[PDB]
Amino acid sequence: MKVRASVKKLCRNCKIVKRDGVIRVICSAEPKHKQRQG
Amino acid sequence: MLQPKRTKFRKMHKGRNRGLAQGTDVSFGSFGLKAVGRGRLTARQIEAARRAMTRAVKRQGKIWIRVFPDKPITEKPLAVRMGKGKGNVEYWVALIQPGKVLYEMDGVPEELAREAFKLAAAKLPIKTTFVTKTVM
Amino acid sequence: MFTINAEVRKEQGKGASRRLRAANKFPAIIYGGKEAPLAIELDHDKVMNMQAKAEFYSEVLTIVVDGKEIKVKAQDVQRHPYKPKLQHIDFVRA
Amino acid sequence: AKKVQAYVKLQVAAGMANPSPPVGPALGQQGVNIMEFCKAFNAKTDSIEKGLPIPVVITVYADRSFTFVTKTPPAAVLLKKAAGIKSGSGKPNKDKVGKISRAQLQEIAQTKAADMTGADIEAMTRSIEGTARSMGLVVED
RNA sequence: AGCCAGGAUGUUGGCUUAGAAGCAGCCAUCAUUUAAAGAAAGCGUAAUAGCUCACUGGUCGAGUCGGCCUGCGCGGAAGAU
Ligand SMILES: [Mg+2]
Ligand SMILES: [Zn+2]
């Protein structure tokens, strides 16, 4: 989990999703890409 | 870093930075990085943004720096009391008012210039916007 | 072929003009030719969309004030310093 | 017909016999071994052409008797004798190195009668023309 | 947007390169069959092998896409009795 103030789609398979008031990036492809805003 | 080759005087009053800008239109290239905010650009910031743009376009097209840092900024050193003369000139700034076109660029496609200006904007302390050359 | 619908404005000056631009209009002026200049108010978004075209700055425009057509040319434009808006246009009678 | 079972497209000069070294490990890895082209490839090399590489299919079987059906040597090789030049690229556009006619390219095309699924003489003609204007010799018309 | 097929031929275009046929990298960036297929975008391969994509036909039967201008909000946001 990359906890960043700037969360971004790092590739085509990334998706922004808002869960419980937190902007997250979930990537089906690359688990490195998963991010949390914080 | 950019700085005047000579100045009449070494040191300037702080002054104020009121007002809107003058160099507001893209006048040399096709695209510009306009300043939405108000502040001062150091010579180091201007250079950092210039390196970012130039590297982004890969020595293609051409870049104009519409702002020149001509104002010397003094600082006092650490552990120095408040009086006893104005501080020494440490760096140079361009004052930037809203509307100032900071950089211009052409010879590139608009998407590439948008990317290059985004990188440069990330180097800079003021909010910017991408503008296009305007017919009149 | 650009047709611009305008209203003659009674209020003029900085307060009236800022009030116009707050109401999403903006002032303009028609001068040139033999008649007295005509201070008008323009709907900002329509004219902004129109002037997005280079023909707007090349062609003769038509401005309809009091249902009356005036053939003009956009001869000067004042823009917002940083916002994509228009402050003013000078129209010269074409 | 049958589904495409397994195949590799790697083939070398035909006239020289037992072309094992220039291919080597690619073909003798899954289904078809070494000494089964010093005759069969040669039993099909003679009746077509000697001394120029000829690509072929290798559709392998569990039954170890793979079917081969060959194609006429491509324009990848042929457009060397007719133009009289060996070199292709390197400086195709900086200063032209090769010269061919349209008629000789048309000739190289006609010899490839069934070499691909084409119904129009002019279609294959401009196909070979494109091949030539690609590699770097200007066709002369 | 899903789902069903394709996603090609000349071609391995090439030049190169310790190894690059689509990818250390440099050009041309053309033609054919085409309803549609890039001289190939990501991977991936020792270059090839290969997963896709760009693009098009069917099912689907109303919207759909992402830019700008703005209101309010969200994260960014850790301290000591
Ligand atoms: Mg006032
Ligand atoms: Zn991702």
Taking each helix axis from N to C end, the angle separating D121-135 and D102-110, rounded to the nearest 10 degrees, works out to: 120
Delineate the domains of chain B, giving CATH numbers in brackets.
Answer: 21-136 (3.90.1170.10)
Q: Which domain holds residue C1?
A: 1-94
CA C59/CA C1 separation, integer angstroms: 8
Question: Which residue in the block uniquely carries the two structure tokens 């279609």?
Answer: D123
D45 touches strand E (CB under 7 A): no
Would you tell me how many other CB atoms lie within 10 Å of the CB of residue D54? 21
For nucleotide E32, the protein residue with its alpha carbon nearest to C1' is D127
Q: Say yes or no: C57 contacts chain B, CB-CB below 8 A.
A: yes
CA B40/CA B37 separation, integer angstroms: 10
Query: Which CATH number do you get for residue C9?
Result: 2.40.240.10
CA D81 to chain CA mean position, Å: 14
Q: What technique determined this structure?
A: cryo-EM
Protein-proximal nucleotides of chain E (any atom < 7 Å from a CB): 9-16, 21, 27-33, 39, 42, 48, 68-70, 74-77
Please name the nucleotide lying closest to A4, CA to C1'. E76
Spatial CA neighbour of B102 closest among B47, B130, B65: B65
CA D52 to chain CA mean position, Å: 9
CA C41/CA C20 separation, integer angstroms: 8
- Amino acid (1-letter code) at residue B56: A
CA B67/CA B96 separation, integer angstroms: 8
Delineate the domains of chain D, giving CATH numbers in brackets.
Answer: 7-71 (3.30.1550.10), 72-140 (1.10.10.250)
Spatial CA neighbour of B23 closest among B110, B124, B76, B95: B95
| Distance CA A10 to C1' E43 in A | 14
DSSP state at residue C11: -
Burial of D8 (0-12, 13-18, 19+ CB in 10 A): middle
The answer to whether C40 and C68 have CB atoms below 8 angstroms apart is no
Overall resolution, Å: 2.4
Quick check: C81 and B98 CB within 8 A? yes
**Into how many domains does chain C fold?**
1
Tell me the three state secondary structure of residue B24: coil
